[PDB]
Structure formats: C-alpha cells, structure tokens
Amino acid sequence: TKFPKFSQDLAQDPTTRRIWYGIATAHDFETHDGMTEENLYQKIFASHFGHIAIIFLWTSGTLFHVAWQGNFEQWIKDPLNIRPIAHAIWDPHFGEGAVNAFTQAGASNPVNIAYSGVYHWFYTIGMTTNQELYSGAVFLLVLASLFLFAGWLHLQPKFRPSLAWFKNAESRLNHHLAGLFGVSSLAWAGHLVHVAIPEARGQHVGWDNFLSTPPHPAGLMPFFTGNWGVYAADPDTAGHIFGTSEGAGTAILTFLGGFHPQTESLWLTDIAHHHLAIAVIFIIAGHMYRTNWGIGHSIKEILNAHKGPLTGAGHTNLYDTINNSLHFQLGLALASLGVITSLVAQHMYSLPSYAFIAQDHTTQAALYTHHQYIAGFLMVGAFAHGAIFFVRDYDPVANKDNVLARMLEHKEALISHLSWVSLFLGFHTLGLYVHNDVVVAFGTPEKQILIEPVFAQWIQATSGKALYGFDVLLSNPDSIASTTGAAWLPGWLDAINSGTNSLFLTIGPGDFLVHHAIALGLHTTALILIKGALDARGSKLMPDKKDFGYSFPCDGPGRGGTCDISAWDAFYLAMFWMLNTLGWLTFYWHWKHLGVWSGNVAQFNENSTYLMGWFRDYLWANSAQLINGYNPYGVNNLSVWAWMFLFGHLVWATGFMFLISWRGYWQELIETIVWAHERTPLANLVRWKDKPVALSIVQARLVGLAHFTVGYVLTYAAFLIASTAGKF
Amino acid sequence: DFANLTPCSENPAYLAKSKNFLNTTNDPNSGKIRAERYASALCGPEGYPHLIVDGRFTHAGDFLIPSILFLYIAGWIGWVGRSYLIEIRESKNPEMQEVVINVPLAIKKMLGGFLWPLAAVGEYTSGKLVMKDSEIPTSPR
Amino acid sequence: ELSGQPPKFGGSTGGLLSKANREEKYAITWTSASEQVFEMPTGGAAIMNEGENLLYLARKEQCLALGTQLRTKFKPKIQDYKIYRVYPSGEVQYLHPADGVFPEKVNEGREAQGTKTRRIGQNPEPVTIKFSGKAPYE
Amino acid sequence: SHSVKIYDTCIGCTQCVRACPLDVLEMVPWDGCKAAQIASSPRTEDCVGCKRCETACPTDFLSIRVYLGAETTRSMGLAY
Amino acid sequence: AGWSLSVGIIMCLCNVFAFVIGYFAGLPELLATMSFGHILGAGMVLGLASSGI
Amino acid sequence: MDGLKSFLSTAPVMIMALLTFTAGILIEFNRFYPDLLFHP
Amino acid sequence: ALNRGDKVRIKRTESYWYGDVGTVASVEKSGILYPVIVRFDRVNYNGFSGSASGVNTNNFAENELELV
Amino acid sequence: KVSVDNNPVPTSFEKWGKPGHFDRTLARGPKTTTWIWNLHANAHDFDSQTSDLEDVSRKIFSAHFGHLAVVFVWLSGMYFHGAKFSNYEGWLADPTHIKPSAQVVWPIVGQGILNGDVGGGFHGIQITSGLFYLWRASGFTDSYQLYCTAIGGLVMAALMLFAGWFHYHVKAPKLEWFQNVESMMNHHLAGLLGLGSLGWAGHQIHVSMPINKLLDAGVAPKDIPLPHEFILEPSKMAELYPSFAQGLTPFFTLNWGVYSDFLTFKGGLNPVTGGLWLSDTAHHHLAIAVLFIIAGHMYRTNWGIGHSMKEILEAHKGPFTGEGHKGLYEILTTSWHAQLAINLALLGSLTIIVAQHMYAMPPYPYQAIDYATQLSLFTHHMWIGGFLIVGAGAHGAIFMVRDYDPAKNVNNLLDRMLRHRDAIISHLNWVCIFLGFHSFGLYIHNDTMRALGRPQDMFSDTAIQLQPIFAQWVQHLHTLAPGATAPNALATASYAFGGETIAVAGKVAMMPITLGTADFMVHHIHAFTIHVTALILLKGVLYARSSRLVPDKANLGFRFPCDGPGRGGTCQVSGWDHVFLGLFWMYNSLSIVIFHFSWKMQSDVWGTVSPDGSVTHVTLGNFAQSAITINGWLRDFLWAQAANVINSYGSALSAYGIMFLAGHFVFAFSLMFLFSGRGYWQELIESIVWAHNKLNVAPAIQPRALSIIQGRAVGVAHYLLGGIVTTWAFFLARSLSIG
Amino acid sequence: ALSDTQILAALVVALLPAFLAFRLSTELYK
Ligand code: SF4
Ligand code: SF4
Ligand code: SF4
Ligand SMILES: [Cl-]
C-alpha cells in the first residue's frame, strides 16, 4: 500500500509534499477515508490505552534508572548536601576535561544531577531503598502491559463498544468522580497512614508486615463509633526529626496547618487527612446523575432549565452540542486541565509537600517553570480546538438563540473590547517602564513611578500576614475570623509571617508592573485565540471561510490580500505571544526567588521597576557562570548547559528562516538544483522516487514555529538550570 | 495603614540621598526643591517615593487629580474629533477634508470642546450618540 | 499530427527536462507575417520564421504565456496559434483554443461545468455533511 | 486537482476567463443575467490555483470560487 | 628650458604629428597633437634624467 | 495663493503643527515647574 | 417595486455591505435573477493587493433589500 | 550640443494642495487608507508617472539639485555647530588631552547629564564624526573661519535650489542633451574629479601644509599667521619650504626635482600626530589630478578627435560571447535604472574601500588615537556601501522588468547570460553551501571540541592551525617594498602590513596587524555571507522576467507579493522580494565584518604604550584564543564589552544605554510584521470598525490592513533599524570608555 | 543478587509491553 493509507488524495501526490502531509494528518481521524462516527470513537478509545501505557513506561524508566544508576540510598542520609543523580552517562566523545567534570555527586563515573525532584517525592511517600524503587519500576511495567492489551482487545469485534456507550455522559461522570477521583484519593489516604507516615517516624511498614501492624494504637474502634478525636491525639512535635523516632507522635489525621519545621513541607498527617476528606465529597459527588434507578439527574433536563430573559434560549440543546462534538469536549478538558496545571505550579512553590525540597532551589525553579510551560500549551490548544469546533461541528439550528450562538451574535463587541483592554495595558505598562528607565538613566531614580500593590498586599493581610499592617480579618486578632477559632490557624499564622519561605512573598512596585505586563499577555493571547475562533466560520473578508475548513494557506492576494487568514493561523500567531507571556512570567519568578535565596531581596525590589535593571542584573549578570561552562582554560559540570545554551540560540534563529522568507523564493531555487542534477552526467542514473518541492505555505509556518519554540525553551532551560545550579 | 512604608521626611535612606538630588533644569536649586517636595510622600527602604492609588483621599493627588485632568483632556480630543468627522459628511466630499483639513471648521470645534461632558450626555439622551445594531455593517455569524 | 519550423534560437538552460520524455510535453504552433524577435517564456530572445512555427515547451502555462505575447506584443497581431499536449506514447491531443473560438468569447455548443444553481452563501453547513467525503461546495 | 465553481451571481463579464493563465475557464450561454452568459470550468485538471480569476471577479462576494484540492504534477506547476 | 631639453621635446611633437596621420577616425584637430606630444615628451626628459642616475 | 493654503492644511503639515505646539507647552511647563511626580 | 434614487439596506449576509445602506441606481428588465443595481458610498475589498480602492456597485434581488 | 525647451511648466502652488496629483490612480481622491501609503511609495517613481523619457530626465535632473541642496544645508550646519557650539579651538590648543565635542544639550527634565566632561572646562556630547581632525588638517584655527564656511554652505544650498527650479520651470534640457554621454564623461573626469583634485592640491600646499607644519612644532594656533599672509608675503612660505623661495615658479621648466621639499613620497605616518604626511597627500592629489585631466580627453565631442563608446563596446566580441557588447550603449542611454544599477554597485563598493583604507592609513591628525572615531567612521562607511550594493540589485531587476527589450538584445552578453541563468545560480548555490560548512562548520567543530574537553583537537594556533599563508605573504612584500620594489618610497604604505609600531601620546596609532587561524576563519565567513547575499540579489535579476514556476512574471511587475497559493505556493517570487531577503543578508554579513573589526583592533592592535615600549592591548590578545568559538564571541566580545553600555545609567553615556534598549525593542517590534499576514489584521480591523460605527465615529477613509508588500517593507525597515541602533549604542559606549 | 541480576529479568519482562505495543500498533494501522 502507498503511504498514506488513510488519504487517497495524498497518496497520489507525486511530490515530496506527500510524505510530510501524511505525517501531519495521521492523527486527524475525522478526515480519513470512509471514517464513520462509531469507528472514530472506537479508534480514540484504543489510542487512549496506548497513551497511558507510554506514561507508565516512562515513570518506570525514571524509577528504574534512579535505582540502578542513582545515589538514592546515600541521598536520604543527607538530602541537604548530596546532589541527587539522574542517570549514568555513556558518551565515547568525552575527553579528559569532560570526564572529570561530570564525575560528581560522589559518583565514580560521569553522571547527571537530577532536577525533576523525584528523589524528594519518592522519599516522602516512604521509599527507603533501591529495592522498593526497582520493585516499583517492574510493577509499572506490567501495569503498562495491562493497558496495551486492553486497547488491543477493544478493537476486536466481540469487544468493540457501541457509539451509545461512548455518548453515555451520565454513567461516565458518576464513575470518574466516585471511582477514578474518589476511591483513588481514598486509596492514597490509605497509603499515607500505612506507609508514608510510619516510615517517616522510623517505623518501617511494607509488603512484609503491613497486614499485621495497625497505623494507630487503637484499631478502627473510634471510627465505627463517633469518637474520631482519637486519631488527632498526639501529633508529631515541633522538634520531630524526619525519618526517626525523635519527636514522632501517634496521630494519623491532623489539621495542624503550616510547615514541618525541619523538612519545611506540609505535615503528612495533614496531607493524609486531606485526601480522606476529599474522597468523601467526591464519592457523594458521583451520585448526582441518573442511571438505571430513576434517582439522579439528566444533564439534558437540568441544562434545558437554565434560561433567562437576557440570554434568550439559555442552555437549550447544549447537552447534545457537547456530547456530539469531541472538539468541544477536548476544548473544555484542555482549558480546565491547563488552569489547574498552573494552580499546581503556584501551590507547589509556596506550599511544598516533599521533605527538603524547598532547599533544592534548582528543582523548585525547574518544576515551576516546567508546569507553567505545560499550562501555556494546554491553554492555546483549548482555544485551538475551540475554533475547530465552530468550523466542523457547530450547528446554528439546534444551537439557535442559546448562549453559544449569542457569542457569535455579538462577536464584534467582544473582539473590539478585548482589543481595547490590550491597548490599555500595553500603552501604560510600557509607559511606566520607559518613564522609569529614562528617569533612572538621568541619575534621578527618585522620580520613578512606583505604585504599591495595595490590593494584593491587602489580600495577604486577610489571610493573616500582618507585615503590611492593614489589620483585617486574619491579621486582626479581634475579628470573628480569628476567634473562630484555632484549629489550623496557629500553625498557618506562623507559616505566613516567617519571611523564610515562599509563602505569600512580600510584594512591592516591582511586583505591580510585572503582573500588569502579565495581564497584557493573557488578554492579547486571548484576543488572538478568541478572534481566531469567532471569525473561523467567516468575516467580511471571507464570508465562506467555513467551507475551506480550519487550516489552509490563504485565499490569494485578491481582495487586498489574505495572508494568515485562517483560524489555524490565529493559533500560529497566538503561540508567539504565549511564549512571550511565559518569558515575562518565568523571568519574574526566577529573579525574585534568586533574591529570596540570597537574602538579598533588595536587588529585585529596587531594580525591577525599570527594564535596564532586568537586562543588567538578571540576564547579563547571571549568565556569568553559564557561558564559562567551557572556555580556553577548562571545562566544568556546566559544560552541557553552556553548549545547549548556544544550541538553543541556534535553533531559534533557524526558525526565522522559515518564518520570514516565504515559499516562492525556494520553489524557484529548487528548480535550478533539479536542473543541475539532471544535467550532471553519471549522477543521472539515480532518479528520485518523489519530486522535490519547497515546503508548503502552512508547513513553513509550522516548521518555523517549531524551531522558534524548541529554541525558546532549550535556551531558557539552559539558563535557568545553570544559573541556579551555579549560584545556588 | 501601611506599616512597611514610612514618610520620606522620617526615612533615613531618603534623607541621605535627598541632599544629593541632581539639578533637573537650569535652576541651580531645582534639586533642592524636589528634595523638599517629595518629602511629604511615603518611602520604601530604598528611600524612593511610593504612590497610593487605592482611593485614599489623603493621596488624592497621587492618582485622582491626574486622572480627572486626563479624562477631561482626552474626552475633549475625542469629542471634538468626532464632532468634525460627522460634519464633513454633509459636504458630500468628506474623504478629502480628512486628508486636507478644513481649518476654519476644525478650530471652531476645538474651542468648543471645553464643555464636552454636557454635550456627550445630551447626545446620548437624544439617540444621537449610539446607533442600533440592526442598522450597522455586520459580518456573517 | 501537424508541425512547422523551429524558431532560430541559440538554445538555453530553461528548456525541457526528463518530464518531457517520460510524463508529457507541450507544443505550440502559430503563423507569422515576417521574421521578428519574441521573448522565450524560458528566458532569452528568439526569432520566429516567416510562415508556420513549431515550438515545444515543458508546461502548458508556458505555451499560453507565449500565446498571450503573440496576441498582444505585435502590431500585426497573431491569433492563429494552437496548443497541443504531446505524450511519450506519441499521442497528441488538442487543447487550445478548445472548440475553435477563444474562451473569452461565448460560443453556442459548449457544456456548462462547475456551475451552482445557488448563491455562494447558500452552501450547506459543514456539520450537516459530516462523515461524508463531500465538502459544502459539492 | 483543484475545484473551481461558479455561482448564479455571475454577471458574465468574462473578466475571469481572460485572467486565467492556463485556459481552465470558458464562457457558455445562460439566461440568468443581462450578459446572457456564465463562466464554466471544464478543464480543472490544468488548474494551478493561482486565484487570478477570483481577483478579477467584480461581484460583491465572488461568483467564481477556487477550492484547492489534491496536488498533481499539473496543479503544483512543475516543469519537471 | 635649456637647448637639449627644448629640442628633445620638439622631436616628440613631430613624433605625435606623425602618429596621428597614421591612425585617425584639420586645424582644430592639431590641438590634440601638441597636447599628446608634451605628455609624451614629459615621460622622456624625466625618464632620461632618472635613468641616467 | 490659495494652493499654498491648502498645502499648509494637509494632514501631515497640520499634525506636526499640533505635536510641536503641544510639545512646546509640555517642555516650557517642565522648565518653570520641574519634578512634579504628583499633585502636592 | 424599487425606483432609482431610493436608499436601500442590504440583507444578503455574504455582502460586504450587509447592514450598510446603498442607493438604487437602476433596475434591469425581467427575468434576470439579480436585476437591481445598487451603488455604495464606500468601497469593498475588491482589488489586487496594493489597490487604493475597491468596488462601489453590485447587483441584488428585490427580496434581499429593505427600503429606508 | 545644448538644446532646451522654454518654460515647460508654470510655477503654481495649486498642485501642492492636491496630494497624489502626480499619479492617475491617486489624483481622484482617497477611498481607503491604502491611498495614503501609495502616495508615498510612488512619489519618486517617475517612470510610472509618465511614459515620456524626456519628462522623467527633467524630473531626475532637478531632483538632484534638491538633493545637493539638503546635503549643503546638512554640511553647513556641521561647520556652524563647530563654530558656535563646540570646543574646537580649545581642542586645537591641547590636541592630546581634550576630547572633540559638538552639540550641547539644553538643561530640561534632567537631560543635562548628557553634557559630559570632555576636558578644558567644556561640557557637551563627545563627537565621533571626525570633524575636528579634518578641520585641523584643512587649516582651520579659529571659530570665524568655520562660521564663514557655514554661511557659504547656505549660499550654495540656495543656488542648488535655484538651479533645480530653473532647470525644470524655465530652461529644461531636451532628452538629446542628457544623452550626451561622451561629453558628460569628459567633464566629470577632468572637470569634477580632475580640477577638483587639482584645486584641493592647491589648498593643501598653500594653506594646510605650512600651517600644519607649525602645529607639529608646537607653535599654537593663535601665533600661526593666517593663510592670506602666506601668499601676500611669499618670503614667509620660503622660510619653511626652501624650494618655495622662488617667486616666479619654474614649474614650466620641468625641473620638478627641486620641489622635493614639499612634494614628498615619505609614505608613512607623521610621528607627531599619527596621520599621513600632508606633503604626501598633496603630491598625491597633484598626481591624480593630471591623470584625470588626461583621462577626460578620451571621448569624441565636437572636433573629430576622441572615441565613440558605441564603437568601442560593439567592437568587443569574442568566440564565446557571440555579439558581445552590442546594444549596451543603447540600454545605457535609454534606461536610468540601468545607469543607477551600475553606479550603486560601484559607489557602494567604493564606500567600503574608503572604510578599509582610512583606518589602516589614518589621513587625519590625532584620528588614529580616537578609537571611537576609528570604530565610528569604519562601520559607518561599511553600512552605507552595503545599502548601495543592495539597491544595485533592485534597479538591476527593475531594468529587466521595465526597460528591457528582447528585440534589442539578441545573442549578446545580456541575452546569453539569461539563457544559462539556471547554470549560474545552481553553481553559486553549491559554492555558498561549501562556504557555509567549511567556514561556520569550523566554529561548531571548535565549540564542541572545547566543550568535550578536547582543546588539542580544535582549529587554533596552539593546535591544528589554519594559517593564512597567502595573506601573510603579501604583508611580507609590502614592508620589504620600501628600498626594493618601492625605491623612492621611504616607509611602507601602512604599518598594518608590518614594520614599526608608531605611537602618539601614550596610545597606539597603528601597528602590525598579524594574521592567524582566527583571521582565516572569519575571512571565510566574510567570503561566505557575501556570496550568499550575491546569490539572492543576482537570482532576483535573472529571474525577474520569468521562471519555470511563473513564465509571465514580467507582466506582474517588479513589485508584487505573489501569484496566489497555487503551484504549491508562490510567495515572494518577485524581484522586489529578492531585494527584501537580501537586506537581511547584507545586514548579517556586514554585522560580522564590523564585529571582526572591533575585536581585532582592541585585542591585537589598540592599547597604551609604556616608556619602555611595551604595548598593553585593550582586550589583552584574547582574540586568537576566543575568536574561534561562538561561545567565545558570545562571552568575550558581546557579554564582556557590553558591560559599558548597560552600566551607563547615571553617566554622560546614559543616552547610549537608552538607545541600546531601543534598538532591541524595534527589532522585536519588526517580528510582528514579518511573522504575520494582513489577512488576520484586516479581520481584526473589521471588529474595531464596527465599534466606531456603533458610536457614529467611522472615518470616511475606510481603514485597511497594510498591503502584503508594505508588511514586508515595514518588517525589514524595523529589523534593520533596531539591529543597527543596538550595535551603534554598543560600539559607541564601548569605544568612548576605552579612550 | 538484589541489584546484580536485577538488571536482567527486568529486561525480560520488558519484552511483554514491547510485544503488546507491536500487536496494538498493527491493529491501529488497520
Ligand atoms: S500567501 Fe504568499 S501568496 Fe498565498 S497569499 Fe498570503 S501572500 Fe499572496
Ligand atoms: S468574473 Fe465573477 S463574473 Fe465576470 S464572469 Fe468569471 S465570474 Fe461570472
Ligand atoms: S485559478 Fe489561476 S488557474 Fe485554476 S483558474 Fe482561476 S486562474 Fe485559470
Ligand atoms: Cl570558548
């Protein structure tokens, strides 16, 4: 069979364009030859199994490599002074100067220092040795196999689920909430009280004896009665030493609040109590919708009920709109997953749950930067598939006059306003920055415009941070909120008022401007993506755009010119802005924490209000150790990052080629090369099986953006790690 | 009630720098005057003035006063310009007067924008400010 | 089928390649009143013979490029030109002008194609024709 | 190959046919408009999709429409 | 100018006067002759002195 | 001549007339009353 | 029917002038599909990239117009 | 040979108040905002304004008169600022301790800090234009002299402006008059350059040389007599140069040997000022003068004597080139674009020569000392020359599309070239790829060997070395030339070739510029980037008319975005789009040339000189060991030398810190236009328009997204600005700090 | 023999998820 098998249109393409476009369309199952709706879902369902197995096979990889080539057993003896190892290094191109550099972390051979923070995670959950790790790698190896066989099984005729089975939203929700979320949470609470909490108190519990040692002196007697107070009997003391019995208690379910004083992380007894409480409220949550017993709701029925005088038809037929369109479903999922992924980033740097991780500055920097980038991708994609929905699945008849339709009905008002807010932020936020630069540059920094984050400062005050002295709610000992009373509060108030962690960092003028620069970035990225979706079906410049689909090169140079006019081109443009937003964002987090970790917060506080300060103090100054990874004198452990740094700058700039110079130049240049080949003697016997052509108009946009993105993260990643690993 | 900030006159970081303030203009005492003038503001540990925009009338001159002064001038510009853009339409050769100004007509409208807020509330309450949606160019939904 | 005289031309690099002998090539004939210079679509100056000419070119678009030049760049206008597609099979097929008259001029005898008894903004919604190979303009 | 379609808004000014550089289009008799003729696309196999026809059309929104399709040696415009 | 230098140049004026009747593609046209003769005689007298050392 | 008058009334001549006048006002005010970061 | 000079509102919805108002320039005899020629105060997008203007006239059917 | 029309156009102000009158499309009036951009993009396109070659020539002629007028106003303002806003006289009295400054900034909003201390009790901006060094050598020793020159510059500006009007509204030359090439050639050679070079030789010998001879003796300026009493009192001239003691000059005796006193061939630098001897540059100009008066007597005019260029060209045919230069005289006398294409290529290539020659052979006093002026003048004339040799590629293609005739070019050089264009571009294509690998791929090899801890594997002088065998050899012959192959030349033309390391004050004016492996690599980078720039621009000329993709590209024009999404995509096929892509490579190429210069001069040349002769270079010779890796350039050049400009806030150099960031901004701004398309932007404007329609504030001139071409034009206009402004601020702040 | 022969065996049981990925791959292809 001629590749691609799924598109006869592409298979006939006599040019090289066949190969590329075959790869770019392999996963758009909807556009395949003779694809039905039932066979679509069944193919997605099987594909999902194969994806899960790749995940478990990846974690097994880290678990196995830590156990095999890592110093995990030595690291748990002194997690504050030993560097955790990622994996071994096997490179025949290494020279003497290089082998001596990467021989580090006490290892006798060349290794890499791990920055994923998995050491801290494994340790905290009760991993003690390289035998539990390895045993963990194998279990996730057979679990993966479990799913790879399942996907194979459900493609067999006897097991193929019906289309009615995939469209059953009621039953999928009841199970995902009560089972996948609830029981899973209840099962982690079980692990925490059985393994993590005990093994943190020196008492080993594992597959050997767990079935014959209770996690508490009492044994489920207070539970089935109503005296749950006993499980919060004797907490771990302030002087508890993690890993040993010195200061350990007996409580399993506490609500202490704040951090463990040694490990500077949340109390396992709080973490345990958390997943227990959440489990319950998730199980009852999975009883909402109707199944085979009359009780429950129809989402359809309750959705159709919410209509009011100002929104016309309300939410009528929205059940079917969603349940019929996967791009709609995929959009909500990506949008939501992308927000909480940000929430993960924001909560894991300010409220660590892993012992001794708040001391590992590099991992804390990587893990935050990492998850924000992931979050940024998810948000673009959410809007991307949002636009695709309007192009391929939206039905104006069933959706007539409801809230979805009315978005389009006043799409002008939305886009123009979103455009104003962006212009509003952009003109002024840049305005103050450039005022300050000039003002400072003329030796008069006292003339700067420095606005106090009163609103954000006031927010901290309401949670008990008395530094600003607003005296409100929790920073008010007389308030009703402080006398509520007690429970978590003493631990929490101590946590928030020690300027020793990253819990509600003190904020000033520097923080005021960056947040507004960030707001510019969220509005503009949303301006692009939302416009790309609302105008996906048509504009005055192209009223029949929907007939052309989501992605297409353009509509010729007629009617003024129509370059980058498709919804796909709105995603492509938006990507540049999301990267930009993350840049400002991650720049902010890093430069501010560098000050924290140095006890020198005065640097960011006093120089972040003008942009030369960012350029001078953050970018130029912290590149010092990075760019010296290698030089005419020697080579140190930062050699890679130095080399990767350039590699990043290179890829980035190679992207400008595919982005600035467009096709026609290259199609002509190729023809001369094709001429040269056919005219060169001896080299004529070799005839290509595929006619060489220049990349397509869309292809070059995509490729150019891919370089730009790979260059963007690899460059910064090499800077974040090296600068923080060097300076600590 | 911001504990972190302190008045510039009682701020040591400011007082030390304050006497080294550079001369902005050709006035040899301009740096001295600034020192005395910013002294009534709140300062950070660095000794630079910080502005309060939460609405405190005790800092009305930090944002409220320059806000009113802007919106008066900005609305003046916007109103007069719109006033002119609508009147040249009746000349049935408007495209040109947008590229080569009817100065006598322009100046006439500029010197009348000093009362634009009363003009704007008037046109609104007579249906002359905003147009129906149905009577406006629109793209396909 | 038919032929003519090759234009007196020194030769260029912009000419035919292996596509001509394996896939297809194209031929244009025409009639000239005199010996006069014309621009080669493949770059370079050539001169046409008085009488019938025969020139082979790589693409159909190249033939029509000369054809338009012949009809517009000479005070005695040339409109007698005929475009053919020559296969390596030896098969020659006639192309332009299709039915004798230029397509610019409506002619009774031609078959309507690609026509739609419908405004462009009266195509069906893409949702209504899901999972059928057809697009709205079909 | 590409798809070229004509809609009943055609006034029959022939401006598209004489714009086409590959002789894809032609005029045929029709009783829809004053000019008593409509554009037609009987040779789409030779269409490259340059959209010169669409640029030339005068009707509010186009009466002729090129939807790019399966690429061939002809529509890619390869002289090799 | 000296006798030798002097005459040494008129010989070159007669040289150019001969070379122009040779190849040429008129009273005003004799101005060009008197011009080339001088420059042609300048490389001589300076060469004669420079070469003699 | 009235042709000259129309040239001086062209958009670019007139915008650089307003920007220059506006600039002169801003400068001259900051000459007599420098360093106003806020209303006293 | 519609006379010359009548100011007319466009309802086509694929039209650059939908929602805008035009002027009835002339009506052609039946049975053409779109016999009413309308003139517009401001041009559309029509024209190759770089053009300083567009088209100010188009044909419509009487069913897709609304007198003003 | 003069023919003229009388009063072809009345002098009326009515056209002024009618923008876009010059074009049929625009004269109507504006309907969209595109009308406004088009009015600007076509104001000088005289070709598209009329088909009468007589009328455009008349426009072009009086066009230059206006250009010469503004350049005079520019120049006059330079002399005026040096005459009433500078410390020139202060610097003239103490050349070695004072820094040259002009333009003093007003004290407002605290900008007065830019008036740095330049010594001598003066405050202002330190200039790098070199005006002070030129004025001293030219003979200025007073403010009044500069002031008089400024007034004279305004007079001449007026006369250029008068001539321009007069030669379009009163007495317009006929096309016949412009086509007098042989006559025009004879006059520019002998009249402009010839007498010009002779006239200045008269100034140098009478004014510059004697005055400049006293300044090097430490006489001061005010004690030196004015240039007038050197002529009025010939005995004074006799006191300095003995040979000048002869009242009635026997220059006609042909006994030229006696003038050996002031017409020398020292061929070196003045040890006092570090500049070329004014006697050398005087004997120089006197020598060039004659060659030019001579050369301007070649072409035939009104006396039968001379040449016909038409006959010369046509009579040059070969077995390989068919009819040869036939018809070239015709296209060079009927197409201005043909003329502009050649003149740009040579003028641009010349301005680059000026750069490479002026630094190694400092013609001006105390110029070599000022490393800022040295770095400023060199990269200036580098950029200028580069822009011009990119327009040469634009007008080369505009000629092919507009003024080229197949009937007038049959089997000649021009036609033959078009018929193997595919062979040309295909071979250059391979050459560029060869140069990209064997030059850049050396650096990538180095960075990698360095990072793998394998320094002995790198390409370097201390490892496997790529010595420039050939270039070193010419340096040998240049310093061995004095005495042997240059008997009458005392010293070498430039000490960069080798020889003595001269020094003025305590700094180095010029010393032997040795060449090693580090030089070998960048010289092949310079070869690489230049070949690629050629490829793009050349390919733009040859395929201007047609390609295998677009056979009828000439009907589409010189400047058009594409021919639609068809044929796989035909974006940027036009000759204009080749000039566009070429502008980036001109930038990329010259940027590495000016970087090569800055590092090489600081690291291996410039520096101070202790009493014992030892030289302490600015960058301590880190070039030969760091200039061979990208990390080295990133670190030891950019990161290191940028320390100055980013640490400029609070000093007189603060302006340079500000512009450094500005260049960065507009660069990033440019990427908005280069990465997007007007399709998106037009649809956006539709939403914004609706809002104005909602409030009855929609303008009559409907808003339109920029054209596809303009998007690109804007795009490259900002990319080039920022990138150059950035480096300007970087170079300036860096060199002003070293001294 | 905890982490000595443990490098082996782990490779044997890794053939299962590989082999089952190959059977799933050929079914998704069809
Ligand atoms: S793409 Fe290159 S071509 Fe297809 S349109 Fe936007 S521009 Fe005219
Ligand atoms: S152009 Fe728009 S209209 Fe004139 S013909 Fe080809 S189609 Fe019918
Ligand atoms: S597209 Fe370029 S080709 Fe296919 S038709 Fe309209 S024009 Fe003739
Ligand atoms: Cl290095």
Numbering used by the authors:
A (entry chain B): 3 to 730
B (entry chain F): 3 to 143
C (entry chain D): 3 to 140
D (entry chain C): 2 to 81
E (entry chain K): 54 to 78, 100 to 127
F (entry chain J): 1 to 40
G (entry chain E): 2 to 69
H (entry chain A): 13 to 751
From the paper:
Recently, an operon encoding a complete, albeit minimal, PSI complex was found in the genome of several marine cyanophages.
Fortuitously, PsaL and PsaI were missing from the final purified complex, making the subunit composition of the crystallized PSI very similar to the viral PSI complex (the only difference is the single TM subunit PsaM which is found in our preparation and is absent from the viral PSI operon). The movements in Q1A and the surrounding chlorophylls appear to originate from two amino acid changes that occurred in the PsaJ subunit between Synechocystis and Thermosynechococcus. In contrast, it is very clear that chlorophyll B33 is completely missing from the stacked trimer observed in Thermosynechococcus. This is accompanied by a small deletion in the PsaB loop, which supports B33. The new trimer is formed by an additional chlorophyll, B40, which is coordinated by the head group of a phospholipid (one of three present in PSI).
